[PDB]
Write a protein that binds this ligand. Structure first.
Ligand SMILES: [Ca+2]
Ligand SMILES: [Ca+2]
Lengths: 371, 53, 140, 106, 6, 53
């Protein structure tokens, strides 16, 4: 049975849609040629990081009043330290063909993102906004801007750089920001005003890595694609555009995107929109969330680490350790180690010494007077 | 039949291969995900793109 | 075995070694590709963090002012200068008698300014306010 | 003045107020530049690990490392630091470099 | 999900 | 590129090409409040060839 091709009109071939729903849907088993899109969002984290707090949630997506202290040193509080936002999406397991030593992982192709809530900035009538002049309207949200987002299969690799090492950031006490002092274990040295390779940290928590001190390390982030922007000014205007047609491609120069290690999609973003000028003259930053529509596909890969080496490397650590006399390292208790293979004609010197050159070829040592 | 891929399963034990973070709620009662779509193969074009089942 | 039975995976360049400057001593074949990730600190006249006293102003300059009377006698700390460096690369030719020699060629450079995210600090303890009771003036 | 030329010999000793890249003589090199004046004008910057810059010339050849050495030079001034007293001071930031190299026969 | 084994 | 729609550049008549330029960079705010313009030179690397006409 089949319909008449002439009697029946033809239509286009759009990609077939299997399912549309929430997070509980990713569990669906899909073929090797399937494609996944995830629409999600991240609220900003700028010191006031929770609306559930009964006392101080009036300033969610805001900071407390920013002021220079006036006397060294500086002691800023967490509520004045806006930090990056981050989240992880757990992806389902996939097949593997151990016979060919190849498995398959998720990769990201494209992300469709846009800053949400831009329309809310035209509110020039917040009851405490500083009038630009007498009998006038409010000073629109403007000034400093910082925008970045990062997509990768690993947590984003960061770099530490602070405008002044004299500042003393709050200590990490089971909560609170994490600063270079927390990573190194020492007070910040004036090297940190420049680039210090010692000051590096993976982005592991939300709202705990302030933007003032951390910046994306360009060296290590090879498995992540991050984009940035900034403008600094007293009351310079903020400009933003938005649409749902602009998409961004994440493939590299070699044709691969970020590979989700641990079947986890790592996302990080941060968007400052400007100041909130108050009648008191006091000032405070502000932010607003970000929209993400990451597209994912299935890519086959070859296991780089052969399983056998992992097995022994695993149980050895699990097996009870053995604290014997040192047999490796600086104080090894080993004197000679010889290695034989095959038969050769008898050489003259029985005290001969041979080794392998830096190029892997066989070499015979010519004896020399040891000083 | 072993339902679990061995390599993916064993790599979970290694830290650098399975990184974990304390990110925003993206799973459960407070999931910050609005929609998820799965595409496989091609079909004849449907009228409504926002199909309601 | 079983070539056709195995799935097909893409072909990417083969990573042969990864490490620090130590790697530059390593030789390699003719059709090789090397890639160097490095950095350079800014020399704003205050050019060393190790000095005892004046290092507090690293990556900065002393207070710039016009003298108000000719001539101008500026100190080095108000003269920001370029930042230069050279990296040593390994030799490529053991024989010179060969009609053709080979040298290192650079094709693409990936650059980025480090530490941009720090500029939002508008609360330096001595930073001038934009207005009374306001916040400090950002780096501009 | 053509007589006022020199080579970027050392670091922290060739001021920016005085020296500028001589366009005529920098043949085996590739340089890029930017500037903005203004007392309190905003500073804008962008960054990504996707922006690579091709160094090849119009004839299809890049810079050749004479003397088995790669020469790199950079300078980035970010802006002022308005102190409460009224004083003003410049500031700079480092740069990242990910040079890609190969072997050409000559 | 690998996260669920823990 | 100096070529026009017809793939023809400027023809150096009189066995010589002519160059003209002008670049101002801004004012010089003197302490007395007075002002004065300022300019910078230009480097030119004209590439040119022979054509039959
Ligand atoms: Ca790297
Ligand atoms: Ca020339």
């Amino acid at each position: 049975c089949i319909p008449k091709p002439g009697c029946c009109p033809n239509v286009a071939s759009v990609p077939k849609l299997l399912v549309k729903g929430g997070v509980e849907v990713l569990s669906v088993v899909t073929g090797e040629d399937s494609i996944t899109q995830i629409e999600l969002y991240l609220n900003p984290r700028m010191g006031v990081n929770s609306p559930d707090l009964p006392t101080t949630s009036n300033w969610y997506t805001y900071t407390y009043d920013l002021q220079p202290k006036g006397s060294s040193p500086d002691q800023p509080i967490k509520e004045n330290l806006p930090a990056y936002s981050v989240a992880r999406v757990s992806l389902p397991m996939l097949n593997e063909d151990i016979t060919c030593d190849t498995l398959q992982m998720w990769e990201a192709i494209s992300v469709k993102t846009e800053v949400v809530g831009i329309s809310s900035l035209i509110n020039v009538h917040y009851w405490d906004m500083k009038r630009v002049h007498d009998y006038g309207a409010g000073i629109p949200v403007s000034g400093v801007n910082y925008h970045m987002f990062a997509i990768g299969g690993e947590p984003l690799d960061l770099q530490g750089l602070v405008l002044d090492y004299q500042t003393q950031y709050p200590k990490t006490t089971n909560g609170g920001p994490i600063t270079i002092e927390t990573v190194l274990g020492r007070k910040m040295t004036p090297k940190n005003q420049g680039l210090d390779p010692q000051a590096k940290a993976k982005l592991d928590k939300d709202g705990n890595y302030p933007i003032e001190v951390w910046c994306p390390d360009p060296s290590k982030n090879e498995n992540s694609r991050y984009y940035g922007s900034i403008q600094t000014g007293s009351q310079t205007p903020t400009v933003l555009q938005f649409s749902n047609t602009l998409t961004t491609v994440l493939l590299d120069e070699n044709g691969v995107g970020p590979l989700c290690k641990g079947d986890g999609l790592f996302i990080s973003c941060a968007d400052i929109v400007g100041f909130l000028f108050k009648t008191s003259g006091k000032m405070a930053l502000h932010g607003l969330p970000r929209y993400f529509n990451v597209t994912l596909r299935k890519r086959w890969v070859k296991n780089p680490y052969p399983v056998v080496n992992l097995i022994n490397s695993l149980f050895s650590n699990l097996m009870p350790k053995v604290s014997g006399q040192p047999m490796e390292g600086k104080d090894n208790q080993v004197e000679e180690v010889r290695i034989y293979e095959g038969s050769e004609q008898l050489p003259g010197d029985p005290d001969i010494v041979r080794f392998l050159d830096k190029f892997g070829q066989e070499k015979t040592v010519y004896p020399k007077p040891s000083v």
